[PDB]
Structure 1
Amino acid sequence: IIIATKNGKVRGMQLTVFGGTVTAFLGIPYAQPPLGRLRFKKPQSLTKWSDIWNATKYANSCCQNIDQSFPGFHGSEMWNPNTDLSEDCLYLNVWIPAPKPKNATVLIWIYGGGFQTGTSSLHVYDGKFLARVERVIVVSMNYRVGALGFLALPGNPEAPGNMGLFDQQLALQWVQKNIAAFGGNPKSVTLFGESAGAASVSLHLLSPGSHSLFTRAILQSGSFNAPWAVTSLYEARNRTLNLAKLTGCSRENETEIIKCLRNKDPQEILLNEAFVVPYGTPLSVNFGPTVDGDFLTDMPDILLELGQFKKTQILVGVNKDEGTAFLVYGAPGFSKDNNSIITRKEFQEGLKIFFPGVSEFGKESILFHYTDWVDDQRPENYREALGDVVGDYNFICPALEFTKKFSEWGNNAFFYYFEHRSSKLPWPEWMGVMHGYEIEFVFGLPLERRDQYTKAEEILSRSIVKRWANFAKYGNPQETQNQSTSWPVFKSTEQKYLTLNTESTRIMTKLRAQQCRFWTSFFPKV
C-alpha cells in the first residue's frame, strides 16, 4: 500500500471498481516546482525527500485561462480544470491493478487543450477503468501550458521554449526509473493523447531525447503537422515582446525582460495572453511548441518528410465531425441552441474568422471546393460545409498525411475513423461526432452500467479498450476473441482504415481523399 520510489516513499488509496480493486496514486511530483527564478525554464530534477508522500488526491492544475463562453453548461465546463490552479503543478498520477501486477504494460496519457488549457484531473481521463479491465498501468501528468509553458526566446535558457514538452518528457523519465516498483514494464510503455496531446505524442516521436522513454504511440485527433501545432520562431518572438509591452517589461537585454516577467503575478500573464495575436482564432495556439533546437532540433515537417523519427508502431485516428466544436466559438450565425442554418454570406464571414491572414483568393479557393454541392437547395449546406472545412484543414488531413509519411518508412500504422455520437453528448445534434468525444470511450466510461450510457456504447467502449490495450501490449490493435473485424495496417498505397461505431465496424479506404488533396497539395501554396 506504500511504494518506495527512487527519490521518496509514496502512499496511495484503494478504489472499488466492478467488484475489483484498483490502486490509485494521485498527485506525485516529478520536478521541482517551477516557481520564482524557475518560472519559464526547463523543469529541474526533484531532490530527494524523507516523509511518506500522501498521494491521495489530484494535485494542482497548471495556471490557465478558462473557457467562460458557456457558464453552467456541462459541454464546455466538462473541460475546465477541476482542481486549483497554481504555477506549482508538475505532478502525475498512477493507476495500478490490484493485486499489484508483475510486468504490466504502461499507458501514459497526455491531455489536450490547444497547449493553453487542460489538466490530468479530468473526469474523462480517469485511469481506474483501464487498470481494472485490462490490468495495464495508467499514468498521466500535468505539464505547463500557455506562455508559462511555451514562451520562447530561442537559445535563451531563461525561456528557451517547449517547457511543457520538457515537463512531459521529465515525467516519462520518472516512469522509466520508478514504474518498476509499481509492477510496470519500462520496456513496454505506450504514449497516448488527444488533439494537442496527440500533437505532443507525435513530437516525442521526433525529439531524439524522448526516443528511449517509450515504445509505441497513439494519436487521437492531433499531430505535429497540424496548422495550429507548431508556432514559428518569427511569430513566437513577436508574441513575447507583445506580451512584454503589454506588461511594461519592454527592455532590450532579453534576459532582463525575463526577470521582469517573473515578478508579474500569474494572472497578469494569463490576461495578456489573448491580445498577443492581432486577429485570434477559435483554434489560436497563442503559445505552443517551437523549434527550440533542444527538444525539437529541426522543422518537424522536414524531420517527418526525411524519416527522422522513432521507428515503431503508431495508432492514429480522428472523429467524423472534428470541426463543429469551434463554429460556436465565434463563427457568425452559429449557436449551440439553434440548428445554426447559415447562408452563403455567413459562411464567407466565417472563413475570415478561421483564415484571417489569408488572401482574398485563398478564402475563395476554399469556398469553391466545398460549395459545389452534391446538390443545392439543402439549407444546412453552408453550415455543414464550414464544419468540414475546419475539420478537414485542422485535424483530419494532417493526421492522415502524418500517417502516410510515417508509414512510408516501413512501420506498422493503424488508422481509425470514430463516428459514434455519444448518447450523453451535451452539445446539440447538428454538431455531430464532436472533436474530443471519443475520449470517454477510450477510457472505459460506458463500462460503468450506472453511468446512463446505452448497452451498444458499453459494447463499443469494451472493444475500443481491448484494441487500445492490445496495441499497447502487443503492437497490434485487434480484438481476437469475439468475432470482430480485424484492423488492417495502413499502407501508403491502399490507405485502409477502420470505422468505429455501435452498428458495424467496416473497413474503408482513402478517407476524405478529395478534400485532403486540396488541403495538402494546393492550399499550402497560398
Structure 2
Amino acid sequence: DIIIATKNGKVRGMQLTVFGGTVTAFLGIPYAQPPLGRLRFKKPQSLTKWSDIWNATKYANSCCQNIDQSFPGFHGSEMWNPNTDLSEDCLYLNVWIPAPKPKNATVLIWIYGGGFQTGTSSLHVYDGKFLARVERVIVVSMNYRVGALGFLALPGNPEAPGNMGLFDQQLALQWVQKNIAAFGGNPKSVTLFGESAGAASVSLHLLSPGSHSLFTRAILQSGSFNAPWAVTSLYEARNRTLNLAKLTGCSRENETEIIKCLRNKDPQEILLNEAFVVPYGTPLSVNFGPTVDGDFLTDMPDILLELGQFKKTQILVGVNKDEGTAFLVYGAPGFSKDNNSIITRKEFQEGLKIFFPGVSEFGKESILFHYTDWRPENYREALGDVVGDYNFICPALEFTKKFSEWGNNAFFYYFEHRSSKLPWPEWMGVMHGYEIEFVFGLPLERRDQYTKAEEILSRSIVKRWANFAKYGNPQETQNQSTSWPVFKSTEQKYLTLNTESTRIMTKLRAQQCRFWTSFFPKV
C-alpha cells in the first residue's frame, strides 16, 4: 500500500506492472471544487481538506461534451470519444510515478486537445505509465472544462468571465507545484506538453503571467494559439453567448440574469445548442474557445507574441505531414474514408467553401491558383494540404519563428510516419493526432502489434521528449542519431521524424506559408 499525503489530504494509488517493472498510478485526484450549480461558468474554486484517504484508483468522470457520432463502431473516430461517464463533476487529474519512488524527477504535464469542445485525459493513448517506466519521469494529466461550460464569455463578468477551462488547467499546474514533491517530483522541472487545442493551451500558458511560475518549458504538437481556430474575437464571443441564451430561452436584459438562467438549464440543453451559436461552421470550428478576458489573457495574443511578452524558455514545436486529411470526410463532397476520394476540380472548389465559408470569391480562387501548380489524386491531395497548411502547419511555424526571435532555443519537428495500425484509409496519410501514441510510448509494448521499426522510432521520440523536459535539449545522445538543431528565424532548420532516416531540412512549406501568413490575411 503506497499512500501519499497531499496538502489537501491522503490519496490512495495503485501499482501497475510495466515492462518487467512497476509504476505507481494515482487516477482521479480532485484538484478543484466541482463546478456545479452556482459555480457553473465560474473560475475553478480551490478544494478543501478531506480527513480520510481518497482512493485514486480509477479514472474520474470526463467533462460534459458532444460526441463524434459520424462513424459509429469505427475505431478511428471512437478512440477519441470519452471513455468515462460525462459529468460537470470532472475536475480531476492523474499522476504516474516510477517505482521505486524517484528522488527529484522531472514532471511532464499533458494537456489534451479537441478544439476546446471535446477531450479527456483518460484516453488509452494518453496513458503515462510507459513514460514513467522508461524515462523515470513523472506524468501528470488533467481534465478541464470544454465547450460553453468551459469557455462561455461575458467579458469582465465574473459569473462568466471566459477562459474557465484554461483556469482549470492552471489550477492543476498549481496543484503540481504544491504537491508533486510529496510524489518524488521536482516542481522546478515541469514541462507542459499537449496536442491540438492542448498545444494551443500550452502556447497561451506561455503568454499568461499567472502561469509563468508554474512550469519550466513547453512542447507544442500540432497546435498554437495563432491557428485560425484557436482564439475567438470578443465580438464573436458576445454574439455566441447571446445566441445560446436565445436558443435556450435565456435572453434577458441584465447580462447577469442571462448567466443565472443558463445555470438552471440541464447540461445536455447547453450541449445540444452549442453547434448553432454560429451561422455557418467548418469541421474545425471552435464555437467556445479562449478569449481575451483581461485576466488569463491581458491583451490580444498576437500582440504579446509579436512584442516579446511571454515566458522566456525553450520550446519544442512540430506538426504532422497530413494534418488536414482527417477533416475532409466531415463535410467535403466526394470524400469518404471508405474509398480513395478521387475528387474533381469542381469538387475541390466546393471543398473550399466548406472550409472557408466567409471568404470572398477572389480569396478562394487565390487558394485554388496557389495549390494547383502540379495524376488523378491531384485535387484530393491539394485540399488536404490546404486545410493542413492553413489550420496547423503555417501557424505553428509562424509561432516558432516569432518566439525564437526573442533569443530562446526552439526546436521544430516534422512527423511523417503513418502508424502501421492506422484504421483510417491510406490516402489520409500521416494524420492529425497520430503522433501521440508514439510520444506516449505505446509501440514500446510489443504485444500490441506495432512494427519493430515503430518501437525504435517511439523509443527515440520518447528519449528526445524526456531529454527536452529534463535538459531543455531534445537530443538522443547514445545511438548515433541525427543531432536536432535549433530553429532560428533565418535558417529555420527542422528535424523530420520517421523510420528510415532522420534529416535536417530548412523552411518547411516555405511557399505555402508565405501565402497563408502574408497574403491570405489581406483577402
Task: Using structure 1 for the length normalisation, give the TM-score.
Answer: 0.99
The answer to whether residue 178 in structure 2 is matched with residue 177 in structure 1 is yes
For the residue of structure 2 that corresponds to 1:278, the secondary structure is coil
Secondary structure of 2:17's partner?
A: strand
Q: What is the Cα deviation at residue 32 of structure 1?
A: 0.3
1:435-493 residue CA offsets vs partner (Å, 9 max, x unmatched): 00000000000000101100000000000000000000000000001110010000001
Report sequence identity in percent.
100
Q: Does residue 524 in structure 1 map to residue 493 in structure 2? A: no
Distance 1:309 1:12 in 2: 36
Question: 1:168 matched to which residue of 2?
Answer: 169
CA distance in 1, matches of 2:357, 2:71: 25
**C-alpha distance in 2, partners of 1:278/1:338?**
31
Deviations 1:338-377 (A, max 9, x none): 000000110101111101011111111100100122xxxx
How many angstroms apart in 2 are the aligned matches of 1:150 and 1:406? 26
CA distance in 1 between partners of 2:287 and 2:226 (Å): 17
Cα deviations by residue, 1:163-208 (Å, 9 ceiling, x for unpaired): 0000000000000000000000000000000010000000000000
Aligned residues: 522
How far is 1:48 from its partner?
A: 1.0
Q: Which segments of 5 or more consecutive residues in structure 2 lack a partner in the other structure?
A: none
- 2:472 is aligned to 475
Aligned counterparts of 1:48 and 1:365: Cα–Cα separation in 2? 60
Q: 1:103-162, CA deviations, whole angstroms, 9 ceiling, x for partnerless residues?
A: 000000000000000000000000000000000000000000000000000000000000
SS of corresponding position for 2:454: helix
Distance (Å, rounded) in 2 between the aligned partners of 1:287 and 1:455? 42
Deviation track 1:396-442 (CA, whole Å, cap 9, x = no partner) reads: 00000000000000000000000000000000000000000000000
Partner of 1:446: 443
Asked whether 1:389 is paired with 2:390, we answer no
Q: What SS does the corresponding residue of 1:390 show, helix, strand or coil? A: helix
For 2:151 and 2:365, the matched residues in 1 are separated by: 34
Q: Distance in 1 between matches of 2:49 and 2:108?
A: 26
Structure 1 residue 255 corresponds to structure 2 residue 256: yes
RMSD: 0.4
Where do 5+ consecutive residues of structure 1 fail to align?
A: none
Query: Following TM superposition, by how much is the alpha carbon of 1:238 offset from its aligned partner in structure 2, in angstroms?
Result: 0.4
Q: Describe the superposition over 1:250-299 as per-residue Cα deviations: whole angstroms up to 9, x where unpaired.
A: 00100000000011000000000001111111001010000001000100
State the TM-score, normalizing by the size of structure 2: 1.00
Q: What secondary structure is seen at the aligned counterpart in 2 of 1:57?
A: coil
Pair 1:216-2:227 in alignment? no
1:110-149 matches, cutoff 5 A: 110-149=111-150
Provide the C-alpha distance between the structure 2 equivalents of 1:275 and 1:181, rounded to a whole number of angstroms.
46
SS of structure 2 residue aligned to 1:16: strand
CA–CA distance in structure 2, aligned partners of residues 134 and 372 of structure 1:
46
- Name the residue aligned to 1:79: 80
Residue deviations 1:52-77, cap 9 Å, x none?
00000000000000000000000000
Q: In structure 2, the residue corresponding to 1:271 is in which secondary structure?
A: helix
CA positional deviation for 1:51: 1.2
Following TM superposition, where does structure 1 have runs of at least 4 consecutive aligned residues deviating by more than 6 angstroms?
none
Q: Distance in 2 between matches of 1:64 and 1:247?
A: 17
Partners of 1:514 and 1:493 lie apart in 2 by 15
Partner Cα distance (2:275, 2:488) in 1? 41
Q: CA–CA distance in 1 between the matches of 2:66 and 2:320? A: 26
Q: CA offsets per residue over residues 219-238 of structure 1, 9 Å max, x none?
A: 00000010001000000110
In the alignment, the residues of structure 2 paired with residue 300 and residue 107 of structure 1 have an alpha-carbon distance, to the nearest angstrom, of: 25
Which whole-Å CA distance do the structure 2 matches of 1:372 and 1:416 have between them? 26
SS of the counterpart of 1:177? helix
Within 1, Cα distance between the matches of 2:192 and 2:404?
18
SS of alignment partner, residue 415 of structure 1: strand
C-alpha distance in structure 2 between counterparts of 1:98 and 1:414, whole Å: 31
The corresponding residue for 2:288 is: 287
In the alignment, the residues of structure 2 paired with residue 259 and residue 452 of structure 1 have an alpha-carbon distance, to the nearest angstrom, of: 52
The CA distance in 2 between the partners of 1:166 and 1:395, in whole Å, is 24
Return the alpha-carbon distance in structure 1 between the equivalents of residues 478 and 178 of structure 2: 34
- Secondary structure at the counterpart of residue 524 of structure 1: helix
